[PDB]
Amino acid sequence: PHRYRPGTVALREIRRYQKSTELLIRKLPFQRLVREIAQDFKTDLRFQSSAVMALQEACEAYLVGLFEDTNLCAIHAKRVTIMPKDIQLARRIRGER
Amino acid sequence: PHRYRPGTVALREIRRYQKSTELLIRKLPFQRLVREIAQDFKTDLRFQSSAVMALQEACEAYLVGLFEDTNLCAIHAKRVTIMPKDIQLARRIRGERA
Amino acid sequence: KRHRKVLRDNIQGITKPAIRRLARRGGVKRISGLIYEETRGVLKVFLENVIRDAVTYTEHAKRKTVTAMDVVYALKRQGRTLYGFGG
Amino acid sequence: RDNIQGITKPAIRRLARRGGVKRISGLIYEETRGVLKVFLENVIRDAVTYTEHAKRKTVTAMDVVYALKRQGRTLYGFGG
Amino acid sequence: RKRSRKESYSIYVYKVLKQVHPDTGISSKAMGIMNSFVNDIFERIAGEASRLAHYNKRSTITSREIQTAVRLLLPGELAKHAVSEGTKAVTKYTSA
Amino acid sequence: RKRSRKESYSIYVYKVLKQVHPDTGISSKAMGIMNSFVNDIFERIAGEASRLAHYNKRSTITSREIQTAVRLLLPGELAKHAVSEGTKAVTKYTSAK
Amino acid sequence: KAKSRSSRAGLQFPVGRVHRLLRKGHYAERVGAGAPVYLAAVLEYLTAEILELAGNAARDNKKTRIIPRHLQLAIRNDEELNKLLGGVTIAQGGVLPNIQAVLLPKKTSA
Amino acid sequence: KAKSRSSRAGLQFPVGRVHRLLRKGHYAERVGAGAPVYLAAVLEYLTAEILELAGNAARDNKKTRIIPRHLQLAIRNDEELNKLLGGVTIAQGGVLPNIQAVLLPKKTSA
DNA sequence: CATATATCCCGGTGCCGAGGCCGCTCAATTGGTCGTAGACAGCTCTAGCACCGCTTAAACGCACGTACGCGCTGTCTACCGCGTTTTAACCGCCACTAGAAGCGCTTACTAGTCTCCAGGCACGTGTGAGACCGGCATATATGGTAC
DNA sequence: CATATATGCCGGTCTCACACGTGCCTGGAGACTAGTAAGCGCTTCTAGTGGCGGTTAAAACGCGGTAGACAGCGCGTACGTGCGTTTAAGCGGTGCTAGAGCTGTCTACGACCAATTGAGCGGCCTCGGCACCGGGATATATGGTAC
Ligand SMILES: [Cl-]
Ligand SMILES: [Cl-]
Ligand SMILES: [K+]
Ligand SMILES: [K+]
Ligand SMILES: [Mn+2]
Ligand SMILES: [Mn+2]
Ligand SMILES: [Mn+2]
Ligand SMILES: [Mn+2]
Ligand SMILES: [Mn+2]
Ligand SMILES: [Mn+2]
Ligand SMILES: [Mn+2]
Ligand SMILES: [Mn+2]
Ligand SMILES: [Mn+2]
Ligand SMILES: [Mn+2]
Ligand SMILES: [Mn+2]
Ligand SMILES: [Mn+2]
Ligand SMILES: [Mn+2]
Ligand SMILES: [Mn+2]
Ligand SMILES: [Mn+2]
Ligand SMILES: [Mn+2]
Ligand SMILES: [Mn+2]
Ligand SMILES: [Mn+2]
Ligand SMILES: [Mn+2]
Ligand SMILES: [Mn+2]
Ligand SMILES: [Mn+2]
Ligand SMILES: [Mn+2]
Ligand SMILES: [Mn+2]
């Protein structure tokens, strides 16, 4: 029986996804959420598939950006684990409130 | 004799200076620094008195802002003391630093 | 004259795995269990702001279809400019 | 000796206090002088660049305002 | 001498100040912040409006563009009211 | 039929691409990102030029405004090289016509 | 004969001045008749909304004349004006009083 | 004659097209003859400056064709382009490989 | 040292997207016209600068010591890695039509032009809001000591 | 509890900025004309939507255990206070004059025009780059083991 030590696969994954550019959220779930949120602003809206892709590109870009800043705040607190309070300080200092 | 416990005057000063809106850097030391930095871009330069005020208003504002965010970063690390590393994290997250 | 499936709780399609992958590209190694709801919260606020603006552009153009350009202008407005979709 | 030092320990303290800072590290003061300088540099560089273009030898408040605007630090009450 | 002339919104801030606070005044500095404020928001709404026109291949900035602009520019509540006072004054102006 | 006429900088990007990297090509998406880049920086310069004119009660955006724009808007060594390349093309144009 | 469009629209804010600034400002080839009316209306509203709260902030301070602080206090204590002027600095405004709770002394008698 | 004003300036970028987009662009009543030449030159420069670094990245990745990742690598690794495009998202760019030190496993005699 | 398990790197294979030929056609170039923006130079007198010498207030440096940062330790459980089972994304195809995108007709809208008429300005005033402030009142931090 | 001190406040005093009345002047607002932007009909057909089933990669769950979060400790000194000392900022001042910036003349240059033509576009056709795959060479983490 073989077993990696906690964090060995995490590093592996960091390298894997920082090499790649493929979108990391599944396409259909994201779309349903775009339709769901758009429907609540206006009924009977259609989307050019590019407008969804553009929206997904912008969303993942934003979230990867935010996990970086989060991670720095985690590390600033002599920790290695990101926590809601990390996200919250990142967003506060960004001015997103 | 009489002595205020360390922390108490500091809080009074926070209360005091948050109450007021007066500029907190002395005007002439500032005015000399503005001219000093300006010389390195264009020589034989003259300043409207208002332009030096504007720069000083925008500088103090910016720094007072940054200390707010520096203070939050210090508190994040379970401290009460702001440290260079707090200013650096604030500036990094703001987008100013890399 | 055709029933559209009523859309409900689709923010949960932003799964734990997907959020973790996003954190990985961000060079995050360890993740609290409370991060995935916190994240969904933030994503949802982000998407609502862009789509509010996007749809505003559409409504102004008197269109019923949201365009890639509408999203791009929305994003530019919010200071999150995006190359590779026109504009 | 330099003009930057004219931005004194107590001045920086006052600024921090208005910021709500209770306790200040000794190293802060130099770090802040570094930050302040980069701020003035970036702002003044643009202000002068505006002066240059108006073919003036006097930097106006309108220069600084348009400069502060460019840098995303819009100032009100000097001719915005 | 030479006189020289430089406009402002100073009068209109005062006329509005007397509507909402009839026995209250305002320092020249504070008048400058109100003046900066008006020109800023003007620039913003005009600008957004300008782009709205361009994005749709239209050569006119109509009250429509000024509205869509205000809706993008102002937060939830402030926008609701803005769109009221705006539509109202347009309606009042065309009838007279 | 015969879809409407859409302009693009993609003809001049390929030209400069062959100047700089004669055996290197470019993908649809890459060319798209290059188009968004040229449109973006155009607008940034054209706007800061428009403001310089206005701030100085001038009815005309001249090469002198483009220049100051480029000084404000490009960082250090990129501005220096841009200005020189700019000034040159003006000078070369001034004498030709 | 001759009466200001400002009055026709029931506005203190100069509809005519605004129409000029829209045309003079190179925003579009042409400017509609409603555009300066609508815009002036919004501008006047926001002016009122700020002055309303700024006037208040003066009474609370026991002063008849609005100073920059009253405008700051007004803008930073209203959620929606503070978002609109998030990126704005009000000269001689100061900041809202706000010590972080962790910085306050012990006091554990409640 | 009919010789491209592009050629008069010794540029690949279309001086005439840029002259149109400046006039049609709600920018100013009047546009000089220099402006579009100067502008098209700066656009051509910046295009070349990034296509150089993006071509180099493509060749390092054993590929004939520049793809967005190549532009992302080109732009983020160059100090001055990264600052110019600091507030820009390149669709399908990805991120620069960067793992903070404190996350890397200890006891490595490499 | 030994071995298990990812990742890299290789040619081989097949698809389809980049890129190059074509022919049609707009928007850009010519070249002549005309209106005015702005270049240039003179003049004015605004307001920026600079040497002076008081008078404080603010900066400085010093020395005490206390609360806080910081490194150590030990507890404990939350979070990681992995095997199994569950699920729904993806793919490739249908079939269906909304509405996007484009064209031609047509006219209220607005811009451009004169003339006029008061709305908005720079000026000049005099006076009341508020800055200052002495000294007095109130709130609160701080330590003593007896429980 | 009492004592020390910082701050708040009163009521009076003064001063200078505000807010008013008064020209005066230019920048608009009533007509008025004349051409274009855009509104609104009609048509084409693109691509957005919704549905189905085969395949399987990703998601979900539960398990087990490790390494990281956290809290409590204790040590050392970097700070905050407060004092006596030094320094220079601020100020009111009296010049001194660069230059901001205003006015008035005169090209040079840029818009507008509206026939002429090749630059650049949408199709269309097609290979060669590269996606995808599996075989073999390392590279590393983990764990067996001998010392
Ligand atoms: Cl020019
Ligand atoms: Cl209108
Ligand atoms: K002067
Ligand atoms: K469609
Ligand atoms: Mn719903
Ligand atoms: Mn190969
Ligand atoms: Mn002139
Ligand atoms: Mn000591
Ligand atoms: Mn220690
Ligand atoms: Mn239809
Ligand atoms: Mn006046
Ligand atoms: Mn006093
Ligand atoms: Mn005590
Ligand atoms: Mn009692
Ligand atoms: Mn008592
Ligand atoms: Mn009183
Ligand atoms: Mn009076
Ligand atoms: Mn038309
Ligand atoms: Mn199915
Ligand atoms: Mn367990
Ligand atoms: Mn514990
Ligand atoms: Mn041609
Ligand atoms: Mn050809
Ligand atoms: Mn090949
Ligand atoms: Mn393989
Ligand atoms: Mn081991
Ligand atoms: Mn051994």
Author numbering:
A (entry chain E): 38 to 134
B (entry chain A): 38 to 135
C (entry chain F): 16 to 102
D (entry chain B): 23 to 102
E (entry chain H): 26 to 121
F (entry chain D): 26 to 122
G (entry chain G), H (entry chain C): 13 to 122
What do the paper's sentences say?
DSB recognition by and activation of PARP1 is proceeded by actual phosphorylation of H2A.X13, which ultimately culminates in γH2A.X foci formation to induce a cascade repair response. Here, we produced γH2A.X using a hybrid chemical approach and assembled nucleosomes with either H2A, H2A.X, γH2A.X or mutants of H2A or H2A.X as the incorporated H2A variant. Nucleosome stability/dynamics investigations and crystallographic structure characterization were carried out in combination with surface plasmon resonance (SPR)- and bio-layer interferometry (BLI)-based techniques to measure the kinetics of PARP1 association with and dissociation from the DSB constructs (represented by the blunt-end DNA termini; Homo sapiens histone and PARP proteins). Additionally, enzymatic assays were performed to shed light on the catalytic parameters of PARylation. This reveals that PARP1 recognition of and activation by DSBs is modulated by histone variant composition and post-translational modification status.
To obtain well-diffracting crystals of γH2A.X-NCP, we designed a cohesive-end DNA fragment (147s) consisting of a 143 bp core with 4-nucleotide 3′ overhangs at each terminus. This construct assembled into NCP crystallizes into pseudo-continuous chromatin fibres in the lattice, with the two DNA termini from a given NCP forming Watson–Crick base pairing with the complementary termini of two different NCPs (structure also solved for H2A-NCP assembled with this DNA fragment at 2.25 Å resolution). By ‘locking in’ the entry/exit points of the nucleosome core, this (type of) construct may generally facilitate structural characterization of nucleosomal systems having diminished stability (elevated dynamics). In order to shed light on the basis for the variant-specific differences in PARP1 nucleosome association, we sought to obtain well-diffracting crystals with NCP, which required screening of different DNA constructs. The structures of H2A.X-NCP, γH2A.X-NCP, H2A.X-S139E-NCP and H2A-NCP were solved at 2.85, 2.75, 2.2 and 1.99 Å resolution, respectively. While H2A and H2A.X nucleosomes display very similar susceptibility towards digestion, that of the γH2A.X nucleosome is significantly higher, in particular for the earliest digest time points in which the nucleosome core DNA termini are initially degraded. This suggests that the intrinsic (37 °C) stability of the H2A and H2A.X nucleosomes is similar, while that of the γH2A.X nucleosome is reduced, with the DNA ends being more available to factor binding. The enhanced activation by γH2A.X nucleosome holds even relative to the corresponding 167 bp naked DNA, in spite of the availability of multiple PARP1 binding sites on the latter.
